[PDB]
Amino acid sequence: MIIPALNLIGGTVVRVVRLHQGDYARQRDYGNDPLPRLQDYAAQGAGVLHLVDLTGAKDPAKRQIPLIKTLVAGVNVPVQVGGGVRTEEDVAALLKAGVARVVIGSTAVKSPDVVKGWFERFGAQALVLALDVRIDEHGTKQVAVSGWQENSGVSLEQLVETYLPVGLKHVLCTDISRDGTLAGSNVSLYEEVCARYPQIAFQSSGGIGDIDDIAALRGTGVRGVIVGRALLEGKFTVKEAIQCWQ
C-alpha cells in the first residue's frame, strides 16, 4: 500500500534534511495547509497516512496534539505519527487523539526493556518500530541513532529479533542514504529484509523519485511504501501511485 507522508513544524508542512549527527534541519516550507493536503491524499485513496511531528520531536511537551486531532478528524484511514516519541505517556496521548499507530524511534534502541512494556500495554498493532539504517562498508545494516558519525553497535536484525518475542509486526525501515534523494528506494535491501522476516510488515521509506520507483518495489514483499517529496513536488499523484502499486 502507498503511504503518503507529511513533516510538520508548528502547523507548517516542510521538507527537512538529515544532518551529520542525525538531527533534522528545515529546508523549505510547502505551506500552512496540512488538512487540505492530507484530504487530497485520503480522497485519492491512500490506505494509510504518515505524519512526523518535528515540533514534538524537539520538545514532547509541545506535541502538536490539537493539530493532530484535527487532521485525524478530517480523514477516514489509519494515521501513523512519529517524531521523538520517547515515553508511554507520549504514545498514549497520540492514541487518545485518534492516531492509529505510533512510530517509535531511538528509544527502542536505547531502552528496549521500556519499549517491550509498550508492546504489552498498547499491543503490536498500535506500534511501528522505525529503523533508520545505514549500510556500512562491511554490509552491516547499522541502526543509526546518531546519523553518519557514530556506529550504534546495533544492527537492523538485532533490533527486529529483540522485539519479535513481544509480537513486533510493523517496521518502518528508512535507508538514510536515500532519504529525500529521489534516487529510487534501496530495492535489494527491502527484498532481503522482507524475505528474511515474512512475519513482519515492512514499510519502505526514502528515495522514491518517480512512478517507476514504485513499480520496482512491487515484487519485494514490502507492505507499505512511504512517499514524501515526490508527492509534494508533484512527480506523480496518489492515484497514479496506487494504480501502479496494484
Q: In the bound complex, what is the minimum distance in angstroms from residue 4's beta carbon to Na ion? A: 10
| Residue 148 touching Na ion (CB under 5 A) | no
- Any idea which residue has 516519541 for its cell? 85
Q: In the bound complex, what is the minimum distance in angstroms from residue 2's beta carbon to Na ion? A: 4
Using CB under 5 A as the binding rule, the residues of this chain from 2 to 21 that contact Na ion are 2
Is the Cβ of residue 21 or residue 76 nearer to Na ion in the bound state? 76
Is the Cβ of residue 2 or residue 5 nearer to Na ion in the bound state? 2
Q: How many residues does the chain have?
A: 246
C-alpha cell at 192: 532481503
Is the Cβ of residue 143 or residue 225 nearer to Na ion in the bound state? 225
Long-range CB pairs of 76-80 (<8 Å, 24+ gap) are 76/42, 77/42, 77/46, 77/47, 77/48, 77/49, 78/47, 78/48, 78/49, 79/48, 79/49, 79/50, 79/51, 80/3, 80/48, 80/49, 80/50, 80/51, 80/128
Applying CB under 5 A, the span of 1-9, 11-19, 85-93, 142-150 interacting with Na ion comes to 1-9
State which of residues 75, 77, 242, 244 lies at the interface with Na ion (CB under 5 A).
Answer: 242
| Residue 100 touching Na ion (CB under 5 A) | no
The DSSP bridge partners found for residue 57 are none
Closest-CB residue for Na ion? 1
Comparing C-alpha atoms, which of 61, 62, 64 is closest to residue 13? Answer: 64
Applying CB under 5 A, the span of 33-41, 181-189, 216-224, 238-246 interacting with Na ion comes to 238-246
| Residue 77 touching Na ion (CB under 5 A) | no
**Number of residues forming the site for Na ion (CB under 5 A):** 4
Which x/- pattern, by CB under 5 A, does the window 188-227 give for Na ion? ----------------------------------------
Q: In the bound complex, what is the minimum distance in angstroms from residue 238's beta carbon to Na ion? A: 9
Q: Are 101 and 77 in contact (CB under 8 A)?
A: no
Is the Cβ of residue 45 or residue 112 nearer to Na ion in the bound state? 45
Q: Where are the alpha helices (DSSP H) in the chain?
A: 34-43, 54-58, 65-73, 88-96, 107-110, 112-122, 156-163, 187-196, 211-215, 229-232, 238-245
State which of residues 1, 65, 100, 182 lies at the interface with Na ion (CB under 5 A).
Answer: 1
140 alpha-carbon distance from chain centroid = 21
The C-alpha atoms of residue 60 and residue 83 are separated, in whole angstroms, by 9
Is the Cβ of residue 54 or residue 208 nearer to Na ion in the bound state? 208
Q: Point out which residues bind Na ion (CB under 5 A).
A: 1-2, 242, 245
